[PDB]
Design a protein around this ligand. Structure first.
Ligand SMILES: Nc1ncnc2c1ncn2[C@@H]1O[C@H](COP(=O)(O)OP(=O)(O)O)[C@@H](O)[C@H]1O
Ligand SMILES: Nc1ncnc2c1ncn2[C@@H]1O[C@H](COP(=O)(O)O)[C@@H](O)[C@H]1O
Lengths: 106, 90, 104
């Protein structure tokens, strides 16, 4: 009864001070929406990030979840790959299924 | 041994948590996890939001989406379906 | 840009056992992990209503760990004695990454 369609889902983990840079990249590519998980902690190649220890909550690591059509993955990584060469963080690309492609594509 | 399951991520406004968890309960979902205090961008609006995570057998997907359909046609929110594997002792 | 396959674990457990799980990941050679705090849940991750049960008052966390496929087996074997005594679960995802060297 409810048809499912393929989509991609990015999990972008980075320092909160770079939130605007990441969301601007998403908005420019035509990404329709995103969800942000705040105050994260994590282990990186050069030390620990402890969200609870930050004096400014906006400085803690964040995870931006963005469901995007496959066509947007390439242009998005063109922007994110060079950012990650200069700053901490990672992007994980997932395959997902959604019920409403029009909510995610245009 | 690895077994296939479907993992749902159901993102919606916290005000509708009770409806969503009751639906999961009524469908026979065995357990769920809730990620709170989320923010985000959606169709006409910036944001409390929550994300409910539920791993279910593939057979439960269709009936759950049917149950969520009237809600999602009237309210903000998204559902992402993932193919995952879970390990169970042999 | 080429993408390369990798696995991604989402380990859900009580925040009280954070150190056990992170020590197990470090020892197995996992390069990094992300911790999502202040989670809550209800029900069980076991085969039935009673097994590996969580209540709304339990403080949970989710540990996200991108790992090479070869580490999945040893990590699940490592978490097995823990999950017979404590509630929680490991969801294994397929993911694609640009830099597999950062993770393997
Ligand atoms: N293997 C991984 N799985 C999950 N999260 C990861 C992984 N590697 C890195 N991360 C996340 O990315 C953050 C930054 O990692 P990284 O770029 O290596 O930082 P740095 O080297 O500056 O300490 C980590 O704190 C963690 O939140
Ligand atoms: N493409 C997307 N990726 C991730 N989260 C999304 C996406 N679209 C919507 N959401 C989430 O769903 C919420 C409601 O969006 P909407 O249903 O469009 O009003 C947003 O505030 C986001 O948290």
């Amino acid at each position: 009864a409810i048809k499912l369609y393929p989509l991609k889902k990015l999990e972008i983990i980075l320092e909160g001070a770079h939130k605007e840079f990441a969301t601007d990249l998403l908005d420019r590519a035509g990404v329709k929406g995103y969800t942000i998980v705040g105050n994260l902690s994590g282990k990186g190649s050069h030390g620990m990030y402890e969200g609870h220890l930050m004096f400014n909550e906006d400085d803690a690591l964040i995870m931006i979840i963005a469901a995007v059509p496959e066509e947007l993955v390439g242009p998005l990584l063109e922007g994110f790959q060079p950012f990650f060469e200069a700053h901490s963080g990672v992007v994980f690309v997932h395959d997902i299924q959604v019920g409403r492609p029009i909510k995610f594509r245009n």
